[PDB]
């Protein structure tokens, strides 16, 4: 199929383990610490991944920063959603950190994790493929609606290139449904909604000051 889609597949970062501290008692603080640590490490690999997306590294460093500051939590959430598609009512944050409903309630995350499971339900019913996942993650970055963009035209061109790759992929692989690309685009509002909820939830955990957070995670929470 499509070269952009095959490129994004090879660019996909390796799996990251959560490694919850086995010496620490189970608690909301432990679960939130574990998840913020996991996000901080994944943010480093997301920054390296973005540089493989055609055209991203040609933007100004200000525009690269702006796109990542608006999209980072969408990119993190799509990863959790993709890993969870084979599971039932469980979120695969990592292979060693799978959260069921009881664990979500214990971490104060039931409402957020229920919205993430809504994303999973719709992608399961649409039989989301890895090809579509990686292309939607790149589109989410390009379409993140930063208020701070310098080169509006170059960011539109990045959107168009990635949109064209999704449409060409679907035209070739899914002739049974000539509107499947647009169905995939219509999944992006719920991702935006769930990301905004997540950022607000963890910004409030930051303000409460009971969960240690590493520098990069903090930098991205603070950006908004």
């Amino acid at each position: 199929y499509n070269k952009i889609v095959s490129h994004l597949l090879v660019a996909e970062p390796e799996k990251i383990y959560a490694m919850p501290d086995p010496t620490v008692p189970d608690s909301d603080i432990k679960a939130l610490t574990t998840l913020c640590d996991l996000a901080d490490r994944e943010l480093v690999v997301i920054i390296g991944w973005a540089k493989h997306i055609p055209g991203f590294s040609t933007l100004s460093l200000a525009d690269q920063m702006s796109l990542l500051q608006s999209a980072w939590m969408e990119i993190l959430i799509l990863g959790v959603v993709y890993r969870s598609l084979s599971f039932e009512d469980e979120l695969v944050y990592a292979d060693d950190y799978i959260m069921d409903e009881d664990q979500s309630k214990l971490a104060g995350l039931l409402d957020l994790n229920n919205a993430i499971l809504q994303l999973v339900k719709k992608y399961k019913s649409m039989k989301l493929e890895k090809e579509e996942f990686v292309t939607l993650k790149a589109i989410a970055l390009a379409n993140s609606d930063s208020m701070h963009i310098e080169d509006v035209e170059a960011v539109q061109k990045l959107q168009d290139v990635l949109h064209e790759a999704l449409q060409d992929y679907e035209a070739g692989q899914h002739m049974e449904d000539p509107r499947r690309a647009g169905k995939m685009l219509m999944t992006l509002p719920l991702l935006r909604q769930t990301s905004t909820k997540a950022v607000q939830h963890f910004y409030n955990i930051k303000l409460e000051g009971k969960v240690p957070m590493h520098k990069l995670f903090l930098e991205m929470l603070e950006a908004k």
Binding site: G48, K51, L61, M65, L68, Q69, K215, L216, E219
Partner: peptide, 9 residues
Amino acid sequence: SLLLHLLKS
């Protein structure tokens, strides 16, 4: 900015 540092590296 750690974000800027990583984008430059």
